[PDB]
Design a protein around this nucleic acid. Structure first.
Ligand SMILES: Nc1ncnc2c1ncn2[C@@H]1O[C@H](CSCC[C@H](N)C(=O)O)[C@@H](O)[C@H]1O
Ligand SMILES: Nc1ncnc2c1ncn2[C@@H]1O[C@H](CSCC[C@H](N)C(=O)O)[C@@H](O)[C@H]1O
Ligand SMILES: [Zn+2]
Ligand SMILES: [Zn+2]
Ligand SMILES: [Zn+2]
Ligand SMILES: [Zn+2]
Lengths: 825, 831
DNA sequence: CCTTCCGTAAGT
DNA sequence: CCTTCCGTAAGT
DNA sequence: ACTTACGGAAGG
DNA sequence: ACTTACGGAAGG
């Protein structure tokens, strides 16, 4: 009703008079308390905030500053969240005291000094980021002196964010005829100087080298619908694993001069121009791709061509050095940091040759401790391998119930205690006070584990699972109980993409709630492994968590370009869209890793090879193979074996064309003489297909009675036919079974590597691009980014399962580097 | 931790010693307070309940009885609900005091004594106002029962509600007759609150028994002929074998029997009331005799035939009790007896199964001897008045005011209601006028004030919620008309409230509109509920699923949804509604069968004379008498020779030729059209359709001809100039057919044994709902046939041209459905 | 004008 | 054993 | 996979 | 409508 100020006013500025206490409707109010307000526009029935300022405007009305809270229902947690728990957000607003409904009490529940040893009114514990779905510890910033009257952490976070984001000129040179020339500018926290190199989108500029793109021949020959009676199912014109729509990598340029204009006497820093020396990627020269197969992905070519771009198109800064001015070798300089490129020659666009670059392209002169990591569901160790490639963790403990995976883990990690028992039983032993198991292996205790990582079985969450038991018993909750008992400093959970949408995202919301209740900072996101150095589509949901005293890491920024079809990392929970902190959407610094860079160096083998150790018949033929085979001399190639297929499947694979996109739909309807007097029968079409109609020859396109709208007729099932009967049987409602008995293409990439490559499975494009066989164990590990020195164990099926279940070491390394960034500062 | 009893225990029972107060962690707890409990299995993070008993078991454990609350998120409201608001439920259980987390504070928000005239710290505190029924989604006022000292130690409203429900639910033997050799004979039994006596009639499922008349089902139709794909190049799209508006899968109505003897068994010395047997005399519906359906077209839907056949059924299969009387024992006429109450059947003859004739029934079939005030109702979006007409057929309301911005609908409403003030202004403007204290508008029409409106009813525009609307992407629900209609309900605060819309109203915007309207009703203190009703189940031959939202004042009783009266096709009886993974259904108990047979197109259109396409004679005479019970209900018993509004739209010569080439067989539509050349009006010539493109989805025809008409059939982009004009087969139908279910029903015919699709505002054979062709005549349905499908009496008047009258008919609530709802509203006016 | 033309998605 | 067979629905 | 269904805008 | 993809059970 009536508003009356209490006490002496606080420091008054030009138009407002800050106060400390106030009385509304016989109540008392002080800065730091909380206030409820009734909404009129949002679907939410109530809003809660905290008072930070109590100024009185010169208009005569009484105002106050409210830093809003966020109910758990408004977060990604939703209805599962504790109704007494609130979260901090970067939302704040000025409002009159006439909208104050009541005064509520909100307390701060800080983690105990012995928080890591635990685990046997309204309140908030963490800050919530709505855009990235990030639960983080509240800032430690405090009101000092002058800001005590309007201290708003939301205003501070907002001012620092937009000031870091906006461009700013630091060092000016000279002003000539209305144009100011600069030498040092900055934006997004990045300092840009003259002589540095800069990432640009591919549409920033072109090259004087004319790239040719003539007509493609259209279906040069018509197809015989009697010989190939299932080709009409390829009308989609879509090729799985094709990099035709793959975007070009970042354009790189050399800043020579920076200039801009003026606005109202001062420099217009909002519109800064950059003039650059164009760099030539080996795929941009006259060689195009065909010459850039063996070259490094970070080797460029200097040019004296020039182009003018805007500073607003700058995506990032990269370090480009001349080859001979280096103080160390090329490999140590390339593997020493990110965004590092090098060049030894220069490219002339008109002469179409390679020279030595001028002297103005030359540069001036022209121990972190590893974390004790426990790896639950370690498998063969791909996740812990990537964590070791980041040099942030020694995996001391390992849990793996499957024996061959545990053996393969022991072969690659000699200093790891590998437990083969069940995770529930193993945790029950350490809860009972036991020191060692029956085998004498010491059990980790509280304080031993500094990081907990694992990838629970995704067979229940997989999109391919047909027969889709309760949460409190599912393995992901046992894996959470490990995090509750040991309370590590960092926590990582890996699963398939569909993990964030299983049962309307209930599993995700419950795992996040359990992390929030323990006091852990946490976040989630989806990452495509193909963006981090592998030639395979592998979207995986990652759940990160950090201790209250630590810093919550960010998600790794993509390093390689990839097909946009497989880069849909968005996640929708309860009508609210959430994305990771990734800022690179269109392009990236490095080109896409292809099948050619993944399998070209491996020798040619027949279907059913069993020699587990054969020699290399050549040297590495790409940067990817050079990274996996190492610089040391290693002539033995291990695990290059393919499954022995039946003569029927073998003949089917021999009749699959080598052209990209080919699959079972290109198979001919013929009879083939096999071993001895065995005969592969022909497929007979004796039923009408009401959906597909007749063919051009008038022949039918149905194989069963269900193609006529009737029920399935047993005894209509054909056996030992070249064209598999089951594929036209259920093809109409299964996307014509695209990819089955399909081939990879050299310029393309793998589909998601599974535990058993079979051409008649759901993901059935496992045929070699040239050879008449399925992919080998080594080719599967190559698609996963495993080093060739990595060992496996078991038979061919056991090793395939180890490769398929594993997290690609490139992706695990990308995550581990962002974890390393938190150990610093 | 430590739990200690406080004081002396009250009313101690055999194994339990009830207490009133207890101490947990040095705290105070007393019966009537509330308690927080941590869950272990549910996704919910917390549970809240109220302590009713605090006994100590003789086993040594300390127990207490918890009547659970229901968070607003756990209800149909979901995230929109007030986080401080709880609801009462019929959930209760015994539990140990070791699970008590903390003691919370819950207050009771009772409606104020001047509630009808409204509408113009300590952490967090909870409140409740209404009782929630999870199965039917019903918000009702809490019961007023109070504890007597004897029950004050374990007073649990959930246990009372469950005990009364299960006692009413269980079968019970009342009056037994004689016990003979282990079998007990009964004379009076009861269940579900229904009293059953010897000599009464009983509803049974169709599988209860058969008849001595053998109904045979000989051959299914053979393969008539291969289809000429050159003459009929669009027949291959009818492989679905589905006939729209077909009553082939329609279930049979209730079997009716006459209770003669009741017997059962024994269990543990007592009578086994759980297994009661009924032997009955079978009643013969006219469609069950040797006449079959074809002879039962003109007979009443409630006329039966007596028989001396016998059959033994179970008492657990009893669906309801019905009143069957012999024709001559009546004290009043047959029409006055049928229109006097529900479930009333009559019979004048008896049927002998072997002689196949009709006699006068024997003497053992004969019976013994052988001012409600109307509610002042405001009708927002009244249209032509179907909703208020159905409310008048229930005799529960005089519609005193009406709001209708469209002029022809308002005029037709005035024609059918002479004592209604019909406002043509906008509802927002009119409510803003009554908020400023103004009495009348510029026209001198008196505006209703607080206390004038006793019932508020309306159906806001459904074109935004209709499934046929393509460009449905305006937000700001708080300003959409449904909130304006809620603002009327907030201002006047009537005793009853009804909102009608399409079924998709409960799934629009991920069910946010429904949750927000229900939340707004809950905030006003209103009891409320929602449901989906099929109009075809209440006396019309039309599929018309409509979402209904009911609401009642706190001092009143929330009505139930009308129980289905007629059987209907199960394809269109999917009344379930799923919101936020939770399934909700109405209180309807009749799912399989019903008391009356289905109303068909024959019962709806057989008496209307034959007219040509484009008829304009607004008044033509009847060429005969009513030919069915339905027509006798709409035409009345009085002599009325003039048939009004039997006019058809004038189709273009092209469309007219298309309709002439539509076969009369059920399920036929545009896909049966021949690809021929037809001479039209004057020198116009209808060209043939040319297939010059490959259809990658449908392939080639049997003649090798193509099945594509545009480049998009090959996967390419649409090519203009490939569009053909003045063709008999419409080009746009094979153009976009693959992704529109082959445009089934377009240029389709109704069948006599079938029913209408949803009656729309403009019948066009090339629209989405395009089966508007007459079963025999080559024309679209008339205005009278549309009003017939909507259940409108033939005496009801319209206004405007043929399109204005069509739009009045389509937008209207079917009077049978509105009457079915109004009867359930009438049951609350009593007691 | 009006005759044609045609992104429901949500259920079931 | 291992070769065939096939209710994702959820997204975009 | 199919079936529902108080339609509206584009095209001459 | 159109593509996704740490598959599992029915069968020979
Ligand atoms: N109950 C259980 N206890 C221990 N290990 C289990 C288990 N259930 C399944 N596993 C094993 O956990 C493994 C997960 S595969 C994941 C491996 C790891 N993420 C990597 O990148 O290499 C499976 O191979 C399975 O054999
Ligand atoms: N803003 C508005 N104010 C008043 N009436 C409106 C309106 N918007 C639409 N209308 C009218 O509301 C009518 C709904 S038709 C519904 C009629 C009624 N349910 C019955 O059974 O007969 C439409 O004809 C339309 O003209
Ligand atoms: Zn602020
Ligand atoms: Zn079949
Ligand atoms: Zn109870
Ligand atoms: Zn087209």
């Amino acid at each position: 009703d009536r508003i009356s100020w209490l006490g002496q006013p606080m420091k008054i500025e030009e138009n407002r008079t800050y106060y400390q206490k106030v009385s509304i409707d016989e109540e008392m109010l002080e800065v730091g308390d909380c206030v409820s307000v009734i909404p009129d526009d949002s679907s939410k029935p109530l809003y809660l905030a905290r008072v930070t300022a109590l100024w009185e405007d010169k208009n005569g009305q009484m105002m106050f500053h409210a830093h809003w809270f966020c109910a758990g229902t408004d977060t990604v947690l939703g209805a599962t969240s504790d109704p007494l728990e609130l979260f901090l957000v970067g939302e704040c607003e000025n409002m009159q005291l006439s909208y104050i409904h009541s005064k509520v009490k909100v307390i701060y529940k800080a983690p105990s000094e012995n928080w890591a040893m635990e685990g046997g009114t309204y309140f908030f514990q963490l800050w919530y980021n709505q855009e990235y779905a990030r639960f983080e510890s509240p800032p430690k910033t405090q009101p000092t002196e002058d800001n005590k009257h309007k201290f708003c952490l939301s205003c501070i976070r907002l001012a620092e964010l937009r000031q870091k984001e906006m461009p700013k000129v630091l060092e000016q040179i000279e002003e000539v005829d209305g144009r100011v020339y600069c030498s040092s500018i900055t934006k997004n926290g990045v300092v840009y100087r003259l002589g540095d190199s800069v990432y640009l989108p591919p549409e920033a500029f072109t090259f004087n080298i004319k790239v040719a793109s003539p007509v493609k021949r259209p279906k040069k020959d018509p197809v015989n619908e009697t010989l190939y009676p299932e080709h009409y199912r390829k009308y989609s014109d879509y090729i799985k694993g094709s990099n035709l729509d793959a975007p070009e990598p970042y354009r790189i340029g050399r800043i020579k001069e920076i200039h801009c204009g003026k606005k109202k006497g001062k420099v217009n820093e909002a519109d800064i121009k950059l003039r650059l020396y164009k760099f030539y990627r080996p795929e941009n020269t006259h060689r195009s791709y065909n010459g850039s197969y063996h070259t490094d992905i970070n080797m460029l070519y200097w040019s004296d061509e020039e182009a003018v771009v805007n500073f607003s198109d700058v995506q990032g800064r990269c370090t480009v050095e001349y080859g001979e001015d280096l103080l160390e070798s090329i490999q140590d300089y390339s593997q020493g940091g990110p965004d590092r490129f090098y060049f030894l020659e220069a490219y002339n666009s008109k002469t179409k040759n390679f020279e030595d670059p001028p002297n103005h392209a030359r540069s001036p002169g022209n121990k972190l401790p590893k974390l004790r990591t426990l790896d639950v569901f370690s498998g063969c160790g791909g996740l812990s391998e990537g964590f070791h490639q980041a040099g942030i963790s020694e995996t001391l403990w390992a849990i793996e119930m499957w024996d061959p995976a545990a053996q393969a883990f022991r072969l690659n990690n000699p200093g790891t205690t590998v437990f083969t028992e069940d995770c529930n039983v193993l945790l029950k032993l350490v809860m009972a006070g036991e020191v060692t198991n029956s085998l004498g292996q010491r059990l980790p205790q509280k304080g031993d584990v500094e990081m907990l990582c694992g990838g629970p079985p995704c067979q229940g969450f997989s999109g391919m699972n047909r027969f889709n038991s309760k949460f409190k018993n599912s393995l992901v909750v046992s894996f959470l109980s490990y995090c509750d008992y040991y309370r590590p400093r960092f926590f990582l959970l890996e699963n398939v993409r569909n993990f964030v949408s299983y049962r309307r995202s209930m599993v995700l919301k419950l795992t996040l709630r359990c992390l929030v209740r323990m006091g852990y900072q946490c976040t989630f996101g989806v990452l495509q492994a193909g963006q981090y150095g592998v030639a395979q589509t592998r979207r995986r949901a990652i759940i990160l968590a950090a201790a209250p005293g630590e810093k919550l890491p960010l998600f790794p920024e993509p390093l390689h370009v990839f097909a946009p079809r497989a880069c849909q990392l968005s996640v929708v929970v309860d009508d609210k869209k959430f994305v990771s902190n990734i800022t690179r959407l269109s392009s990236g610094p490095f080109r896409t890793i292809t099948v050619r860079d993944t399998m070209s160096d491996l020798p040619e083998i027949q279907n059913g090879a069993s020699n587990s150790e054969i020699p290399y018949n050549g040297e590495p033929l790409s940067w990817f193979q050079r990274q996996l085979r190492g610089s040391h001399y290693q002539p033995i190639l291990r695990d290059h074996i393919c499954k022995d297929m039946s003569p029927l499947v073998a003949a089917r694979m021999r009749h699959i064309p080598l052209f990209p996109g080919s699959d079972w739909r290109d198979l001919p309807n013929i009879q083939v003489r096999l071993g001895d007097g065995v005969i592969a029968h022909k497929l007979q079409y004796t039923f009408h297909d009401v959906k597909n109609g007749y063919s051009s020859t008038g022949a039918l396109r149905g194989v069963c009675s269900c193609a006529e709208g009737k029920a399935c007729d047993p005894e209509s099932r054909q056996f030992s036919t070249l064209i598999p009967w089951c594929l036209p049987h259920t093809g109409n409602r299964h996307n014509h079974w695209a990819g089955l008995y399909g081939r990879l293409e050299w310029d393309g990439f793998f589909s998601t590597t599974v535990t058993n490559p079979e051409p008649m499975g759901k993901q059935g494009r496992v045929l070699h691009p040239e050879q008449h066989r399925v992919v080998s164990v080594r080719e599967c590990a190559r698609s996963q980014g495993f080093p060739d020195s990595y060992r496996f164990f078991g038979n061919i099926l056991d090793r395939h399962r180890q490769v398929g279940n594993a997290v690609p070491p490139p992706l695990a390394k990308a995550i581990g580097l962002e974890i390393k960034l938190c150990l610093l500062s």
